[PDB]
DNA sequence: GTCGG
DNA sequence: GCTGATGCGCA
DNA sequence: CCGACGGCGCATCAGC
């Protein structure tokens, strides 16, 4: 927080491009100066010193000369106080209401949490949870819950199958000492990017975590991929229900998938330019070589995490220092 | 909104 | 009833 | 001045 209060207001102008406008590039325009400047070592003391950071240009660093002598920023306060973009961007926070959710509920006078549980029959099943648990999804995950969540999750995979690899990612992963949800990349021996699909692999492992009444509700679930909420068990006070990701990826894509997953955001938007800017278009499946012309080879073999480093000549960076 | 064509 | 079109969330 | 900025799995539902 060196700059927590100029990251923070382009962070909010990011919120409101996203939101309200719908202008997508604008909204990560934004995202990204705010991390460069949140890396940035030094307290910034004018626009045009921001304006020497990569990401930031005229107009945000005239934002910044205005914030460092006001203290506030004139676009922004306009923003709040009007009725419509406030209310657009406060139903956003309800997961499953995005940009376009949230307009056409406010278009019709539904713009309170109170409007939309009194609306409940105008709300798809992911919303309803959303609405559902809106305070649970706005807390952070206590590293000690998520330590006890991982117990849990490794544990009953066992159970179903000795031979499947279940790995926490995300921010868990880097040591972060909160988290905003659980994110868990399954593997299993008979699943590989050759393979059949034999059906229910994930399957099982989500019917089982619902079995021990750790899932208690599910967003999507299909294949590969299972978005749902969990909660640890508890006269004493009850956890908070908390999101859960798992995602079932091909075994000899283990690596590229944990790198990816265990992120962070824009360190992987990072590694992805860069990797072009060496000869390689890294993603989060695979790592193939590139071409001129637009052709990328056949994925490299990748045996570890950081063999891909090796070949992108990245100095290797651990889980930890990779938040962006 | 920003940066490299 | 179906499905092409679109929305959502997401490291 | 201008255009690129990453893409996909899964759920819903308007328009047939
Ligand atoms: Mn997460
Ligand atoms: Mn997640
Ligand atoms: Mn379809
Ligand atoms: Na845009
Ligand atoms: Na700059
Ligand atoms: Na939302």
Redo the contacts with the bound molecule.
Sequence with gaps: TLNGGITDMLTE?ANF?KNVSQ?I??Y???R??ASVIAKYPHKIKSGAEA?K?????????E?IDEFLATGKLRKLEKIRQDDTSSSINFL?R?????????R?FVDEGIKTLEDLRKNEDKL???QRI?LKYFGDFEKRIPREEMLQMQDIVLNEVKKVDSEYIATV???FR?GAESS??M?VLLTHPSFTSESTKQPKL?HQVVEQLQKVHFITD??????????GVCQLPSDEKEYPHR?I?I?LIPKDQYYCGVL??????????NM??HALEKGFTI??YTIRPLGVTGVAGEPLPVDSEKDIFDYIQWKYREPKDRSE
Aim: positive net charge.
């Design positions: 102008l491009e202008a590039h604008k990560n325009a934004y990204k100066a304006k950071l990569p990401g930031v240009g005229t107009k945000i660093a934002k956003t309800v997961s499953g209401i995005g940009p376009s959710a949230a056409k798809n099943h992911h959303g990612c995300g921010s880097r905003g949800d994110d994930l599910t967003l999507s679930k299909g294949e590969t991929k299972f978005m999101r990701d995602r990816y997953f265990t992120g962070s955001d824009i360190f992987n938007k992805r330019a993603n989060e």
